[PDB]
Design a protein around this ligand. Structure first.
Ligand SMILES: OC[C@H]1O[C@@H](O[C@H]2[C@H](O)[C@@H](O)[C@H](O)O[C@@H]2CO)[C@H](O)[C@@H](O)[C@H]1O
Length: 138
């Protein structure tokens, strides 16, 4: 449905209790998915399932400040499956983004970018069909 890369405005930025739900389907032979929670040019939270990083599936999380990626946080747990529908839920908590994929907690990403209200765009890219990207307050 939705065009990828998709930019989901997060009006007024993120706030704890904001739940962002991304439904899509990983393309066959997907290489990557990326969610980029952006604070302007900075990526407050880059959530980057990599389907083939040295023949491993890994989730790389990072923050890009001033065009410099920070310390990657890597999660070996990889709930995405090429070709398959997924649901990513990013719950903004006070101290971290909490990411659940297909209703299973996947990872937390401590806020490195502290101005949550300035994290006002979510870029959704990569090898997905994007069915829906929405947010709500829980
Ligand atoms: O850190 C997220 C960021 O990673 C970049 O790739 C890194 C790669 O993860 C690392 O193993 C290597 O040593 O450096 C690369 C360049 O910084 C991706 O290019 C970028 O898109 C993000 O996913």
């Amino acid at each position: 449905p939705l065009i990828v890369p998709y930019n989901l405005p997060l009006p007024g930025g993120v706030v704890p209790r904001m739940l962002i739900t991304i439904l899509g389907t990983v393309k066959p032979n997907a290489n990557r998915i990326a969610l980029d929670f952006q604070r302007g040019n900075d990526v407050a939270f880059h959530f980057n399932p990599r389907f083939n990083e040295n023949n491993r599936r890994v989730i790389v999380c990072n923050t890009k400040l001033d065009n410099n990626w920070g310390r990657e946080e890597r999660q070996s747990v990889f709930p995405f499956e090429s070709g398959k529908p997924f649901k990513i839920q990013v719950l903004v908590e006070p101290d971290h983004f909490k990411v659940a994929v297909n209703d299973a907690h996947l990872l937390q990403y401590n806020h490195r970018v502290k101005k949550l209200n300035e994290i006002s765009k979510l870029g959704i890219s990569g090898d997905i069909d994007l069915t829906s990207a929405s947010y709500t307050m829980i």
